[PDB]
Amino acid sequence: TSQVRQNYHQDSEKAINRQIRLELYASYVYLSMSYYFDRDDVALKNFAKYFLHQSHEEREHAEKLMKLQNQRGGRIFLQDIQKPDKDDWESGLRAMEKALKLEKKVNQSLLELHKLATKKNDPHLCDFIETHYLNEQVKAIKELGDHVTNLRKMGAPRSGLAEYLFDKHTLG
């Protein structure tokens, strides 16, 4: 038991370790999405940059939870990171729809984490989660929703023209 550990429940500790794994997973998925758009047969540069940026942000959220684990005197245990569910993400619109689903999954996880911390009367952990994660997730979700909407409204994915113009006028 760490010399710094105080009011930090073993269930919170384990759940932080589960959240680190999920973030690393989200990072990997966004990486895969990014380089799908860099394919010579997809060729959507700003989709590629957009996803690569989300991949780097998810990694940073992982690192920030590992930092938190050590700050509170928990112990980091890393697990296998599963490969993403697809190799070929099919289109700009389908990839955005999948990212929206993925972010809502990560949000559901973060909401269960905040609820756990609440039940364990861990206001530090609660505030950490609210300040650094919950509003970032709401914002990402809103932006992905907006992007899905525009693409659909523009005629994706049957219009490859819509995907191209979207890449240029929104993502660029």
> Roughly what angle, to the nearest 10 degrees, separates helices 10-36 and 92-119?
170
Q: Which residues contact 43 (CB under 8 A, 6 or more apart)?
A: 37
| Contact residue for Fe ion among 25, 47, 61, 95 (CB under 5 A) | 61
> Contact between 23 and a second copy (CB under 8 A)?
no
Gyration radius (Cα) of the chain, Å: 18
Cα 166–chain centre separation: 22
163 in Cβ contact with 156 (< 8 Å):
yes
10 makes contact with a second copy (CB under 8 A)? no
Contact 47, 94 (CB under 8 A): no
Least spacing, CB of residue 107 vs Fe ion, in Å: 8
Query: Is 57 part of any known ligand binding site?
Result: no
> Which residues ranging from 102 to 141 are in contact with Mg ion (CB under 5 A)?
127, 130
Among a second copy, Fe ion, Mg ion, none, the one that 158 touches (CB under a kind-dependent 5 to 8 A) is none
From the list a second copy, Mg ion, Fe ion, none, partner contacted by residue 61 (C-beta under 5 to 8 A by kind): Fe ion
| Residue matched to tokens 């525009």 | 150
23 is in an annotated binding site: yes
Closest to Fe ion by CB, 58 vs 163, is 58
The residue at minimum Cβ distance from Fe ion is: 61
**87 to 116, contacts with a second copy by CB under 8 A?**
87, 100, 104, 107-108, 111, 114-115
Question: 7 with 127: CB under 8 angstroms?
Answer: no
